[PDB]
């Protein structure tokens, strides 16, 4: 069968599959709420596993992890206003929700607003935060980052609220959940799997905060603002009731209590084995767990997982679809605590995944609205994405998704809370995440109002929209597994390299003052460019029929993402080793961060660090070009 045949069969299955019904079913009482490792999470895990069996997939299996999670306990979580002596003035709130991995502690101090708690928000404040409590609005960055930023400026605790403007919620009393681990995975098995075989040694993640953090209602936030002075910058665009700093006599005391529980979590898997190279595979993944009912958070994605696995199984069993490479379907737990189930799988089976898993597709929050189609991914996937948007139609308008020629230059990189992030940044598996989306965040995420009722009321076209999410991901699967080319565009890294060199070129004076040079970086970027041209030439001249020469060429494509994983750092201590998309002092952004500080001239710049960064970034790029180029003896 040809691409056209497979596209139509998919279109058909799609036309008949019932998306809203699947989502409605996942919102039933047996599955709600479904905090990771809870009875109801387990119930949904068994459902999903049993469905996979019914679909008659090549193989259905499960992994079990025991992970440590700090959760709300029976004691008081409270924020109260306190006169300058400690005497109660007013209880503000006993919040319903919590922030996992918060420090358990009670702290008292001034309250200072820091907008979203970005580094620049902190830079631009007139009020100093040293020794005071911070209040920040949800949005823009993760809770974990908000807290880390605050803690780095010696703040003593954090409050998070949803402002009316950015989050138009009628009910002002609404609670909400999240976590503050600056990381993914079980914080207590950093860089290795949460399996009994490890016997759980003492080991703690650098990403754990050391101050307390708590979510509060808008009601609560307003009560606090009524004890505070200073108009919030209008460029914050928050509500009028916003204020910046506690009045002179007034403190606030934050008390949070939690307990560290060992929790059993389940990842549920099926595979459709490939027909030619079954040992290579794509992975398709969705978070199953959530605080609250999690219709948008987890149900939409889980529904897509199910229907995709079903349709693909029909296509193979009935319409003669023969993918050359395999397809794994993964239903993850403890996504709500930082992609924990996914991360532990990656850490557990890295040796099995290496150069075998060649792409990951995430399904979480694929439907939040209908206005925009937004995507984040490895550059390796951009072309596939482009082709898919040019032939898939918007569910509301009837028009193709590809409206914007320059879309690729506006893509934001995967962030810490997206489960695709570890796939790319840690294991170096090209990954993609995508959504139908508004300009607003979907406001019920992490709340008890994330229900089917709310979702369909807000998105009446849900079924058509979900159908369109499914078609995007299904086309990815087919293009990725069916052909004898991979649809991984290595040439996309040339413009990433240009961007990097261009940014660095701004600091040529600093380089010159240090007696350093950009020649070798320039030269390595040229080597990478030439290596991609040769490879594309080899593809053009290949006997497509000839499976050996096609395997040789394709295996070179399958090493590209990997070779951007820094080989110089400890994967245990710095797991996001990808020099482009990862985190830490080995990345390319970090190198610029440091060098920028030289103009600042504050003794913030670390020259020894920067010299080592430049060396290793240079060689990582050069080494990638060299390897892409062919055999050792053929390098110039």
């Amino acid at each position: 069968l040809y691409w056209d045949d497979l596209k139509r069969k998919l279109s058909e299955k799609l036309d008949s599959t019932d998306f809203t019904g699947t989502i409605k079913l996942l919102n039933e009482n047996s599955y709600v709420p479904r905090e990771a490792g809870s009875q109801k999470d387990e119930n949904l895990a068994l459902y999903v596993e049993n469905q996979f069996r019914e679909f008659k997939l090549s193989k259905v299996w499960r992994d079990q992890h025991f992970v440590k999670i700090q959760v709300k306990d029976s004691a008081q979580n409270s924020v109260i206003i306190v006169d300058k002596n400690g005497r109660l003035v007013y209880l503000v709130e006993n919040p319903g929700g919590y922030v996992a991995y918060s420090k358990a502690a009670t702290v008292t101090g001034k309250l200072v607003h820091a907008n979203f708690g970005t580094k620049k928000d902190f830079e631009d404040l007139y009020t100093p935060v040293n020794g005071s409590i911070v209040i920040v609005r949800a949005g823009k960055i993760t809770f974990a980052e908000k807290v880390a930023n605050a803690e780095s400026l010696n703040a003593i605790g954090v409050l998070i609220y949803m402002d009316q403007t950015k989050f138009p919620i009628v009910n002002a009393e609404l609670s909400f959940f999240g976590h503050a681990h600056l990381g993914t995975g079980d914080p207590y098995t950093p860089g290795f799997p949460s399996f009994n075989h490890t016997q759980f040694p003492p080991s703690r993640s650098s990403g754990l905060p050391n101050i307390p953090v708590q979510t509060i209602s808008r009601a609560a936030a307003e009560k606090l603002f009524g004890n505070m002075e200073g108009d919030c910058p209008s460029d914050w665009k928050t509500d009028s009731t916003c204020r910046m700093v506690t009045s002179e006599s007034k403190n606030v005391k934050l008390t949070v209590s939690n307990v560290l529980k060992e929790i059993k979590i389940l990842n549920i898997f099926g595979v459709i084995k490939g027909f030619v190279e079954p040992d290579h595979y794509v992975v398709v993944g969705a978070q199953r767990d959530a605080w609250g009912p999690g219709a948008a958070k987890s149900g939409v994605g889980t529904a897509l997982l199910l229907k995709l696995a079903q349709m693909f199984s029909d296509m193979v069993l009935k319409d003669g679809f023969q993918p050359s490479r395999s397809i794994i379907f993964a239903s993850w737990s403890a996504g709500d605590f930082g992609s924990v189930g996914a991360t532990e799988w990656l850490e557990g089976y890295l040796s099995s995944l290496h150069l075998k898993a060649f792409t990951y597709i995430n399904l979480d929050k694929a439907v939040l609205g209908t206005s925009n189609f937004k995507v984040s991914a490895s550059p390796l996937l951009y072309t596939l994405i482009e082709k898919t948007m040019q032939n898939v139609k918007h569910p509301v308008t009837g028009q193709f998704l590809y409206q914007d020629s320059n879309w690729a230059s506006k893509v934001e990189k995967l962030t810490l809370d997206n489960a695709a992030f570890p796939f790319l940044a840690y294991s170096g598996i090209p990954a993609v995440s995508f959504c139908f989306c508004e300009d607003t965040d979907y406001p019920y995420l992490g709340t008890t109002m994330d229900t089917y009722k709310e979702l369909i009321e807000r998105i009446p076209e849900l079924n058509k929209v979900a159908r369109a999410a499914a078609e995007v991901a299904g086309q990815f699967v087919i293009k990725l597994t069916h052909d004898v080319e991979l649809n991984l565009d290595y040439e996309r890294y040339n413009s990433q390299l240009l961007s990097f060199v261009r940014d660095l070129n701004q600091y040529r004076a600093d380089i010159k003052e240090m007696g350093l040079s950009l020649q070798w970086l320039y030269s390595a970027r040229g080597d990478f460019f030439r290596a991609t041209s040769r490879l594309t030439t080899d593809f053009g001249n290949a006997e497509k029929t000839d499976r050996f020469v096609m395997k040789k060429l394709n295996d070179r494509v399958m090493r590209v993402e990997y070779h951007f994983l820094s080989p110089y750092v400890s994967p245990k201590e710095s797991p996001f080793r990808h020099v482009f998309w990862g985190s830490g002092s080995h990345t390319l952004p970090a190198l610029l961060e440091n060098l920028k500080l030289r103009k600042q001239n504050n003794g913030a710049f670390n020259e020894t660090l920067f010299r080592n960064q430049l060396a290793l970034a240079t060689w990582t790029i050069q080494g990638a070009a060299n390897a892409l180029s062919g055999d050792v003896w053929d390098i110039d």
């Binding site: 599955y31 709600v32 709420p33 905090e35 990771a36 490792g37 009875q39 959760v71 929790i263």
Partner: peptide, 14 residues
Amino acid sequence: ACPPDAHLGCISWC
């Protein structure tokens, strides 16, 4: 409304 048995879906103290 969450169901009356919501706690079974919670590892956090309900």
